Ligand binder design. Structure first.
Ligand code: CA
Length: 279
């Protein structure tokens, strides 16, 4: 399949080089997979989700996304126009309030929720979780992410937006999950992107168009935006078979565009998420 005039990040994920604008992908499009977006929620009624999104959990007085961040991330995973895996099922877990804040205890509860909740969902091709959030190093937060991964969920987490070594942030610093840095449309490391040995992969993160609340769209930037490209890619690859939750981060790294990004600090992987789709 070919989507013309796609957001640059989608085109990038299916290209051996930067500067094209058509997204190419296998028509299966993540059908039969599921992605949990653990964030401020998802506006499930957005036409871009086509009934494939739903809220499954909140820790606040509402499950509504009153921020937009979660809706944007979900859009990059699986919206019809702005998404990587255009046929995946999207499950919203609201661990962040409408200001985008959340206590680590609530975030941990959300991760353990997903590890159990997947047993209440139909995801024959596999389960992914996208965590576009983080804070300072916490062994408890890292351990929760590790449990989620161990339970059979492909966990993708944002590296963070501090232009610093991600070793000092959680869940970014958890070795067993897939830690995602951000790049721009000219294949530069995004200026805010964290880096370091704990990173596994980079994805498009600067000026990313996606869904927003009130049935709208907007372009924003962050490792928060890179993460759902990788989460969607994992879901897509899992329905193709290609890989599994336990192996998807390694597979994505194995098949990535290599050595193409600029301003990657010595010691950080130079790997850009790539679907290796041959039309
Ligand atoms: Ca990691």
């Amino acid at each position: 399949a070919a989507q013309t005039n796609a957001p640059w990040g989608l085109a990038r994920i299916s290209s051996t080089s930067p500067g094209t604008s058509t997204y190419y992908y296998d028509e299966s499009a993540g059908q039969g997979s599921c992605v949990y977006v653990i964030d401020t929620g998802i506006e499930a009624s957005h036409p871009e989700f086509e009934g494939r999104a739903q809220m499954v959990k909140t820790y606040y007085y509402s499950s509504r996304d009153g921020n937009g961040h979660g809706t944007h991330c979900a859009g990059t995973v699986g919206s019809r126009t702005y998404g990587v895996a255009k046929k995946t099922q999207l499950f919203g877990v609201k661990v962040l309030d409408d200001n985008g804040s959340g206590q680590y205890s609530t975030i941990i509860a959300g991760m353990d929720f997903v590890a159990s909740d997947k047993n209440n969902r139909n995801c024959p091709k596999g389960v992914v979780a996208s965590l576009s959030l983080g804070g300072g190093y916490s062994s408890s937060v890292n351990s929760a992410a590790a449990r989620l991964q161990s339970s059979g969920v492909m966990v993708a987490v944002a590296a963070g937006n501090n232009n610093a070594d991600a070793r000092n942030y959680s869940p970014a610093s958890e070795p067993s999950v897939c830690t995602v840095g951000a790049s721009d449309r000219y294949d530069r490391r995004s200026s805010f992107s964290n880096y370091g040995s704990v990173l596994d992969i980079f994805g498009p993160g600067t000026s990313i168009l996606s869904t927003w609340i009130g049935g709208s769209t907007r372009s924003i930037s962050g490792t928060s935006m890179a993460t759902p490209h990788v989460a969607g890619l994992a879901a897509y690859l899992m329905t193709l078979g290609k890989t599994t939750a336990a192996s998807a981060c390694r597979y994505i790294a194995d098949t990535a565009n290599k050595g193409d990004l600029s301003n990657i600090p010595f010691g950080t992987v130079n790997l850009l998420a790539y679907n290796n789709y041959q039309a």
